[PDB]
Structure formats: structure tokens, C-alpha cells
């Protein structure tokens, strides 16, 4: 068996022409490798693009062309529509089975809305208290959410999720600060801070 390798991340602007390569540990990639290009979208959404090195799948916009470049394969996206942001995996046939590349996260604006919620009563009653800060409407989906109690940064307790792309080509995420019934009442304010593209946004509650 061998090891297929792809560039971890390729960034591009809409309309640009980007080339995703793929190679093997076995050596040169010929036609008898029947390279397959699978596009993966959020939630394990797989879509076949190319197969047999350059055979476009049934119903895929011609801007997706497969080709062999030197000793590597190559998926070429000419005129990247924003919707081409996804992962691209190249699979190579190594007699009797396929061997998949790790994937290439191809990346082809807006400020966030913070939404704080104080702990529920039934939860405080259990000597616990979770503050929920929901971040909506940010693009690109890449934030750094920190917390602050009384103005003092908090470290242990915060749980922030991965940014999900809402259908609207915008993202959302949710951070949590798990405190005790005691601590919640113990402080003055609780601040949920999010940093996005150099500028910070913060919302608090008491």
C-alpha cells in the first residue's frame, strides 16, 4: 500500500483558477491509478467530481477538470464560484482497493451578533449555572471567543463550538461558561467577548 498526499489548505478568491494536486508514496501516478476526485461538504456530504483521472461525474459544471500533471494528479477549478468551498479528496486505486488522500480544504465579510442568556432557574437549583453566548452572523467563520468576569478574563470553564456555516453563507457558533450556583451570584458582571478580524465585540450581563 502507499500514502496519498494533498496540500492541507488552498485559499482563493472567487473566479480564480486553483489547482489541487495529489501524489503517492509509491511513485508516479499513471492512468492505472484511476484517480477519483470527491468533494466533501459539511455533514459528510460527498459528491463525486472526477473519476478514472479525468471523467467528470454525471452533472458537474465543466469548470472541474481532472488531469495528470507530471507524476501527480490535478483537479482544476477554473472560475471558482463561492459554492466551491469544500474539501477535495483524491482517491487512488492500489490494486484491490482505494487509498484516500487526507483532503484539501479549499477556501474561496460581516461582523458578529452576540446573544447572552443567564442560567436557567432549574439549573441554579442544582447548584450549577451555564451562561450561553450565541454568536450569529459572522463571515468569515473564524472567531476567538473569550469570557470575562468583572472585567477579569476567565479561562477554565468556557466551552466554545466549531463555526457552522448557516445556509446563508454566514456562520454561527456557541460558547458556554459553566459556573456554579454560587459563582454566578458571587459576581458583578459576566462578559462574552468575541474577536473577529481585528475588531472586538462584547456583550455583558449581571
Amino acid at each position: 500500500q502507499a500514502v496519498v498526499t494533498q496540500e492541507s489548505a488552498l485559499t482563493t478568491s472567487p473566479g480564480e483558477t486553483v489547482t489541487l494536486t495529489c501524489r503517492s508514496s509509491s511513485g508516479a501516478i499513471t492512468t492505472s491509478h484511476y484517480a477519483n476526485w470527491i468533494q466533501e461538504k459539511p455533514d459528510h456530504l460527498f459528491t463525486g467530481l472526477i473519476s478514472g483521472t479525468n471523467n467528470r461525474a454525471p452533472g458537474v459544471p465543466a469548470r472541474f477538470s481532472g488531469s495528470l500533471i507530471g507524476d501527480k494528479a490535478a483537479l482544476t477549478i477554473t472560475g471558482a464560484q463561492t459554492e466551491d468551498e469544500a474539501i477535495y479528496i483524491c482517491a487512488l486505486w492500489f490494486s484491490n482497493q482505494f487509498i484516500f488522500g487526507s483532503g484539501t480544504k479549499v477556501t474561496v465579510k460581516s461582523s458578529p451578533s452576540v446573544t447572552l442568556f443567564p442560567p436557567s432557574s432549574e439549573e441554579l437549583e442544582t447548584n450549577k449555572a451555564t451562561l450561553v453566548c450565541t454568536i450569529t452572523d459572522f463571515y468569515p467563520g473564524v472567531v476567538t471567543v473569550d469570557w470575562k468576569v468583572d472585567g477579569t478574563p476567565v479561562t477554565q470553564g468556557m466551552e466554545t463550538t466549531q463555526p457552522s456555516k448557516q445556509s446563508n453563507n454566514k456562520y454561527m457558533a456557541s460558547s458556554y461558561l459553566t459556573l456554579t450556583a454560587r459563582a454566578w451570584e458571587r459576581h458583578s458582571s459576566y462578559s462574552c467577548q468575541v474577536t473577529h478580524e481585528g475588531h472586538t465585540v462584547e456583550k455583558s450581563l449581571s
Binding site: 460527498f46 479528496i89 482505494f98 450565541t134
Partner: protein
């Protein structure tokens, strides 16, 4: 019209077996090959096996030879993947794709059925907090805390309320998940109307409808 639909998420104890299914439609079941692949957590896809439904030609890899066993039901258009001797490292999302030849395969894929080799959630209603309405819209949320395994299915007003429902991605801490959901109701409607957040946990057979009150 071409579609391969897979079974739902499964929870298997270690040392056990799972029989996933992948039903097909929109094409001749017995003229295309059925390949199965799996993707353990942070690992990248692994090829498991393949079967030609018409001939009942099942071809595996050395690795899964004895643990994976594909069978095809020509009458129902379903291909089954039996997996025995379940281990923790078997936990992954198993997917099925159809194919014709090395020149044409893996074009149409299933959705993937997640297997995990049981504690229901605790739902807490999240009332506005800041009673000073942000605008013509107010937002209620539902905290689905500490559950296992994935997943849960949050719904608002049993589906009546589908406009502006944001169910966020779960977080994990000490083998227990927690997730948030929200819905933005125009001021006027709440609390004049009753707003309920329904949460179902298939793996435990529990359902909880929490009336979210101020």
C-alpha cells in the same frame, strides 16, 4: 432521482455486531457495484469492501476480511454491512457509494450512518433574561445539557415554529455532550402564546417538551 439512503446512527457496545443498511432507488440495483467506506474521527477515509448485487460478488480488503460481511437483498434494493467484534476504534461514520468501473465509481453517495461503540439529556428553558426587548423580536433558547450518545433532535412547537430556528453544534466534556437551540419569535406572540422546545434522544427513547416561560 438517484438516491442511496442509509440507516440511522447506531450505538453498539464493545465486542458486539452492527448491521447497517443502504437502500437504493432511481437506478438498476443489480448493474452497479456497492462500495463501503468509513471515516474514523480524525483519520481520513478507509475503504472497507464492495459487492456486486447482481452476481453477489463481494470483494474485501485484507484488513476487514473476517469482520465485514456485505449481503444484498435484490428484492428490496438494500445492501447490508455486518460488522462484528466491535472495538472503540470502529467508531466512525460509515458511508456507501455506488460505482460501475474504475473509470466511473463513487459518483452518488449515501449520507453516512454514524456508529458509536446511555444518559438522556436535561433540557433547561432559556428565557430572554434581559426583559427589555431588543426590538420587535425576542429570542428564546433551549439548553440541552449533559447527554450521551449523539444525537438529539430539537424541535420548536413540534415543528410549527420552523422560521428562524438555530440549533448549534454540540460541545463535549467528560464523555457528555451539551448543545443549544434558539428561535426568534416576534415580541407580540410570546408570552401571549405558549412556546415549547421539544428534544428527543433516540438512543434512550426519551422525549422532553419544555415549556419556555419568562
Amino acid at each position: 432521482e438517484v438516491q442511496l439512503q442509509q440507516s440511522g446512527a447506531e450505538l453498539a457496545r464493545p465486542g458486539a455486531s452492527v448491521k447497517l443498511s443502504c437502500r437504493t432507488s432511481g437506478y438498476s440495483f443489480t448493474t452497479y457495484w456497492m462500495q463501503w467506506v468509513r471515516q474514523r474521527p480524525g483519520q481520513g477515509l478507509e475503504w472497507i469492501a464492495a459487492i456486486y448485487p447482481g452476481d453477489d460478488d463481494a470483494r474485501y480488503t485484507q484488513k476487514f476480511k473476517g469482520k465485514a460481511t456485505l449481503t444484498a437483498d435484490r428484492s428490496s434494493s438494500i445492501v447490508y454491512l455486518q460488522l462484528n467484534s466491535l472495538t472503540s476504534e470502529d467508531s466512525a461514520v460509515y458511508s456507501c457509494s455506488r460505482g460501475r468501473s474504475l473509470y466511473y465509481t463513487m459518483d452518488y453517495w449515501g449520507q453516512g450512518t454514524s456508529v458509536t461503540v446511555t444518559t438522556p439529556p436535561s433540557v433547561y428553558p432559556l428565557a430572554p433574561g434581559s426583559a427589555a426587548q431588543t426590538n420587535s423580536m425576542v429570542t428564546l433558547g433551549c439548553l440541552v445539557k449533559g447527554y450521551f450518545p449523539e444525537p438529539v433532535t430539537v424541535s420548536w412547537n413540534t415543528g410549527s415554529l420552523s422560521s428562524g430556528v438555530h440549533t448549534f453544534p454540540a460541545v463535549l466534556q467528560s464523555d457528555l455532550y451539551t448543545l443549544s437551540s434558539s428561535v426568534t419569535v416576534p415580541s407580540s406572540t410570546w408570552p401571549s402564546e405558549t412556546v415549547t422546545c421539544n428534544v428527543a434522544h433516540p438512543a434512550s427513547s426519551t422525549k422532553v417538551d419544555k415549556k419556555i416561560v419568562p
